[PDB]
Amino acid sequence: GPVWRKHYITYRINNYTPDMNREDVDYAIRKAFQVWSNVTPLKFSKINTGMADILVVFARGAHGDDHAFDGKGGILAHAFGPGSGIGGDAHFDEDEFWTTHSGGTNLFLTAVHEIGHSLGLGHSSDPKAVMFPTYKYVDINTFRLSADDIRGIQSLYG
Numbered sequence: 001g002p003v004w005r006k007h008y009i010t011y012r013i014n015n016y017t018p019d020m021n022r023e024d025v026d027y028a029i030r031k032a033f034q035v036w037s038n039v040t041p042l043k044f045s046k047i048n049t050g051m052a053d054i055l056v057v058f059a060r061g062a063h064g065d066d067h068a069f070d071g072k073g074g075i076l077a078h079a080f081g082p083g084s085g086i087g088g089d090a091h092f093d094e095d096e097f098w099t100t101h102s103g104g105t106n107l108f109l110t111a112v113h114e115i116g117h118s119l120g121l122g123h124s125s126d127p128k129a130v131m132f133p134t135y136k137y138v139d140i141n142t143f144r145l146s147a148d149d150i151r152g153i154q155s156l157y158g
């Protein structure tokens with residue numbers, strides 16, 4: 001399936017959840033990309049204008065694609081695989097309550113998983129992996145990709 005065929009990848013935050021401090025959204029998204037560039041040759045850069053490879057969006061309900069959100073709970077976010085246009089883009093459900101911590105739904109953890117999809121990774125059946133199909137909070141100050149997540153990404157890049 002698709003992968004990015006270039007090493008410098010850009011992203012852009014289309015808009016910001018009111019759930020968080022802005023700088024906290026910026027840092028959570030940045031840390032999430034870093035998790036992946038730590039184990040691949042990819043470099044990620046935030047641009048503020050123009051067309052990014054990966055558009056980061058907060059939206060609720062029906063939001064102009066075929067992956068309508070469902071209110072609070074259920075689906076937290078979704079992302080498109082590598083490709084032009086909406087390819088790569090990662091959408092976060094505004095009906096969730098985004099946080100830097102264990103309360104609500106953690107944006108950083110969610111963003112890690114969604115960026116995995118943006119890079120072309122699918123799901124793992126291993127509950128330790130961030131790409132397990134269903135969300136499970138783990139302490140983010142000590143967060144590490146599982147060996148399973150590492151083999152998956154390294155089967156696509158590097």
Ligand SMILES: COc1ccc(S(=O)(=O)N[C@H](C)C(=O)O)cc1
Nearest residue numbers: 075076077109110113133134135
């Ligand atoms: C932190 O990882 C997760 C973030 C969101 C979800 S999810 O929101 O339950 N499912 C979407 C469609 C997905 O697999 O991307 C499941 C796991």
Ligand SMILES: [Ca+2]
Nearest residue numbers: 071072073075
């Ligand atoms: Ca939801």
Ligand SMILES: [Ca+2]
Nearest residue numbers: 053085087088
């Ligand atoms: Ca895109």
Ligand SMILES: [Ca+2]
Nearest residue numbers: 019094096097
């Ligand atoms: Ca919200």
Ligand SMILES: [Zn+2]
Nearest residue numbers: 063065067091
């Ligand atoms: Zn969407």
Ligand SMILES: [Zn+2]
Nearest residue numbers: 113117123133
């Ligand atoms: Zn997923």
